[PDB]
Chains A and B, each alone.
Chain A
Amino acid sequence: INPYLYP
């Protein structure tokens, strides 16, 4: 989803 959490 966002740069700190892959999806």
Chain B
Amino acid sequence: MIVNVIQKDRLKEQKLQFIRNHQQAFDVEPIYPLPLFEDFVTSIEGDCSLEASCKIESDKLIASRFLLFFEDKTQEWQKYLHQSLTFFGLVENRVGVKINYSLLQQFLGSSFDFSKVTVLSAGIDLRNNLAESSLKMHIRIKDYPEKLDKAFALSDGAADGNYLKDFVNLIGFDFYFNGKSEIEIYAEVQEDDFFKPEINNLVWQHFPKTALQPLKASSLFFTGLSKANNNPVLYYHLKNRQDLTNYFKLNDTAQRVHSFYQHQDILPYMWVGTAQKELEKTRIENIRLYYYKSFK
């Protein structure tokens, strides 16, 4: 029992540490309301992962981006959903904002089968301009075509085609502090399928050649579809974060992020997000970089 007490406290601090490392590297002052997210990660007692992230816009570094993945192998999805929403409510109270939940409500509907959930995340993407700040949630669904149809319908035409239902498992929800909300659909291709002719037919031949190059170093590929996106966002899951510079032509700002992370005590893999037209360039100007730590 005493072992559990030590480990509990240890995990709490290790999580805050990962968060502080990231914030302290890129922002002298924490963006409000980061301390509320810090309290939320602390309140979660099971096994989790954290994502710390930077969005680079030329020389603009946006670094107050964090996500928690519920990974306690009990599969208590409804419990985790209720904890996430409780946290979101607290943010509403302290900040004095009202979140628009309608897209999540319609997606959940009345009959949600939680046994079909394989990932749940909750988090923040915080700005100095409160209105531009957002709360985030992802839900990954397996063998739930009824819910896939719903999310596609909710996309409001950002869903490029109904043939993409074959590729979609992850659903993203953004909740802006100004009462605007967005849904995102992520079309995926796994590594085992990269070289299949059906995949070349339905996916690869629609992308320029430069978009295909980072697949060599990747275990997974998403295309993020949302009407909040200026362009389709291509996501590459690099097996080793060290390969970033080999496959992506980084600007100074993104190199700074890359440099900081090369020798942090974090997971070997990373995610990279960039618009298709950035890869056509001689130097990427707009890029999203995602780093991970697990806490068992």
Contacts and interface: CB of A to CB of B under 8 A. Distances in A.
Contacts of B222: 4
Contacts of B71: 3
A2 B140 contact: no
A4 to B, nearest CB: 6
Nearest to B190: A5
B219 A6 contact: no
Contacts of B269: 2
Interface residues of A, number: 6
A6 B222 CA distance: 15
B51 interface: yes
B81 interface: no
Contacts of A5: 118-119, 140, 169, 188, 190, 220
A3 B220 contact: no
A1 B294 CA distance: 12
A1 B191 CA distance: 11
Interface residues of B, number: 21
B219 A3 contact: no
A3 B118 contact: no
Contacts of B136: none
Contacts of B220: 1-2, 4-5
B170 A3 contact: no
Nearest to A7: B118
B140 A4 contact: yes
B41 to A, nearest CB: 14
A1 B118 CA distance: 12
A1 B49 contact: no
Nearest to A3: B69
A2 B121 CA distance: 13
B67 to A, nearest CB: 8
Contacts of B190: 5
Contacts of B237: 2, 4
Interface in B221-247: 222, 237
Interface of B: 49, 51, 69, 71, 118-119, 121, 138, 140, 142, 169-170, 188, 190, 219-220, 222, 237, 269, 271, 292
